[PDB]
C-alpha cells in the first residue's frame, strides 16, 4: 500500500507541473483565436457581419 500511494504521489508531483507547462504553453496559443470569437459574438449580438 504505502509504496503504491507514495509513488502515485510522486506521479502527481510530476504530472502537476507537466500539465501546468502544457497550460501556460497553450495560453499563448489561444490568444490568436480570440479575434474571430469576438467578431462572431458581436455579429450575433447585433445581427450583421460587422
Amino acid at each position: 500500500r504505502v509504496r503504491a500511494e507514495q509513488q502515485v504521489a510522486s506521479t502527481l508531483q510530476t504530472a502537476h507541473e507537466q500539465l501546468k507547462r502544457e497550460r501556460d504553453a497553450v495560453e499563448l496559443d489561444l490568444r490568436a483565436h480570440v479575434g474571430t470569437m469576438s467578431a462572431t459574438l458581436a455579429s450575433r449580438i447585433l445581427g450583421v457581419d460587422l
Binding site: 502527481l12 502537476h16 497553450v26 459574438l41 449580438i45
Partner: protein, 345 residues
C-alpha cells in the same frame, strides 16, 4: 484513483482556461460594439431591428391598469369608483374658475382631515345611512366652503372605506381630476403629461430636494414655500395648471416619497385618457418616426393606447427596453452582453 486525480485536475485546468478565454472574448466583443456604436445611423439600425423584432411578439395579455385602485384593499374600490361615477356627470357643467376653487377647497379639506385623525375616525365608520356624518359635514364646514365642494364631500362620505386615510386619498384624487379637467378644457390635454414627467426626471437626479420635500413635520406652508421658486423658475414650467398639482402634492403627500408621488401624478394624468405609460430606454434620443412606430406597435402589443418616456442613458449601447406595467422587454445590447457573459461555459 491517482490516475483519476491527475485527470480531474487536468479537466479543472481546462475548465479554468475555458471560462477565462470566454471572458476575454466577451470583453473583446464589448470593445467591438462599444467603439462600433458611435455611428448614429447604426444606433438607428439597432432601434429598427429591435422594433421589427417587436413586430412579431404580439400580443400580450395585459389587462387594464388603474393608478390608485391597485392598493385599495377592500370597501374602497367600490367607494372611489362610485365617487368617480358620480363625478362623471357632476363635473361636465362646472366652469374653469369653479374647478380651480373646487380643487383649492378640496386640498384644504384634505389638509384638515389629515392634521387630526380623530375626526376622520368618526368620519370613516361603516353604516348604510350616514346621515349623522352628513350632519357633521353640514355643521363643520358649511359656513366656510362653497356649494360644489361640500356637495362632493357629501357624496364622498356617502360610501364606506377601508381605513381613515383612504378617504383623504380619494378627495385629493378628486382635486387632481378637477385640475386635469380644467387643463383639458384649456387645450393643454397632454402638455401636462410631459411637464409632469420631465419634472419627475429632473427631481429624480437630486435626492436632496426630493427627500426634504417629504418633510413629515415641517409646516405644509413651509413645504409649498420649498416648492415655490424651484418650480417657479423659467420657461421650464410654462404650464399654468401643473403648479397647483405639484403644490397640492408637496403639501399633502403624507410620507410618500416625492420622487414616487410625482410619478404617480404623471401616471394618473396619463390614465385619465385611458392610456398607459411606457418607460423605455435607449442610447440617445430617438427620431420621432421611431417614436411613432414604437408607440403604435406597443399599443398593438398591449391592446391599449400607450405613451412613451425616454430615460435616455448611453450605457445601453443601442437597443430598447420598455417597462410597461410590471413586465420588461429588455433588448438593450448592454443586457445582451451581460447575458452572454453569464451563459459562458
Amino acid at each position: 484513483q491517482g490516475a483519476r486525480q491527475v485527470d480531474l485536475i487536468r479537466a479543472q485546468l481546462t475548465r479554468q482556461l475555458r471560462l477565462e478565454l470566454g471572458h476575454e472574448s466577451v470583453r473583446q466583443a464589448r470593445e467591438l460594439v462599444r467603439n462600433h456604436v458611435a455611428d448614429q445611423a447604426q444606433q438607428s439600425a439597432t432601434v429598427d431591428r429591435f422594433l421589427d423584432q417587436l413586430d412579431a411578439m404580439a400580443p400580450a395579455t395585459a389587462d387594464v391598469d388603474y393608478p390608485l385602485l391597485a392598493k385599495m384593499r377592500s370597501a374602497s374600490r367600490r367607494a372611489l369608483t362610485s365617487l368617480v361615477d358620480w363625478f362623471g356627470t357632476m363635473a361636465q357643467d362646472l366652469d374653469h374658475q369653479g374647478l380651480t376653487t373646487l380643487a383649492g377647497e378640496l386640498v384644504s379639506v384634505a389638509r384638515l382631515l389629515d392634521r387630526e385623525a380623530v375626526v376622520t375616525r368618526y368620519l370613516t365608520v361603516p353604516a348604510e345611512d350616514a346621515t349623522p356624518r352628513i350632519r357633521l359635514i353640514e355643521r363643520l364646514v358649511s359656513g366656510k366652503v362653497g356649494a360644489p365642494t361640500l356637495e362632493v364631500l357629501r357624496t364622498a362620505v356617502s360610501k364606506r372605506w377601508s381605513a381613515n386615510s383612504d378617504l383623504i386619498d380619494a378627495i385629493e384624487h378628486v382635486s387632481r381630476q378637477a385640475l386635469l379637467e380644467l387643463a383639458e378644457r384649456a387645450g393643454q390635454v397632454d402638455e401636462v403629461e410631459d411637464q409632469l414627467f420631465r419634472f419627475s426626471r429632473i427631481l429624480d437626479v437630486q435626492p436632496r430636494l426630493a427627500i426634504l420635500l417629504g418633510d413629515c413635520a415641517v409646516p405644509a406652508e413651509g413645504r409649498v414655500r420649498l416648492l415655490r421658486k424651484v418650480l417657479e423658475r423659467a420657461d421650464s414650467t410654462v404650464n399654468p395648471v401643473v403648479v397647483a398639482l405639484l403644490s397640492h402634492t408637496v403639501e399633502l403627500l403624507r410620507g410618500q416619497a416625492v420622487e414616487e408621488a410625482v410619478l404617480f401624478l404623471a401616471e394618473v394624468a396619463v390614465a385619465r385618457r385611458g392610456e398607459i405609460v411606457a418607460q423605455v430606454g435607449a442610447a440617445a434620443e430617438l427620431s420621432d418616426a421611431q417614436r411613432t412606430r414604437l408607440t403604435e406597435v406597443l399599443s398593438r402589443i398591449y391592446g391599449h393606447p400607450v405613451t412613451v418616456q425616454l430615460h435616455i442613458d448611453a450605457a445601453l449601447l443601442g437597443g430598447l427596453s420598455i417597462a410597461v406595467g410590471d413586465e420588461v422587454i429588455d433588448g438593450t445590447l448592454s443586457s445582451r452582453l451581460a447575458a452572454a457573459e453569464a451563459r459562458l461555459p
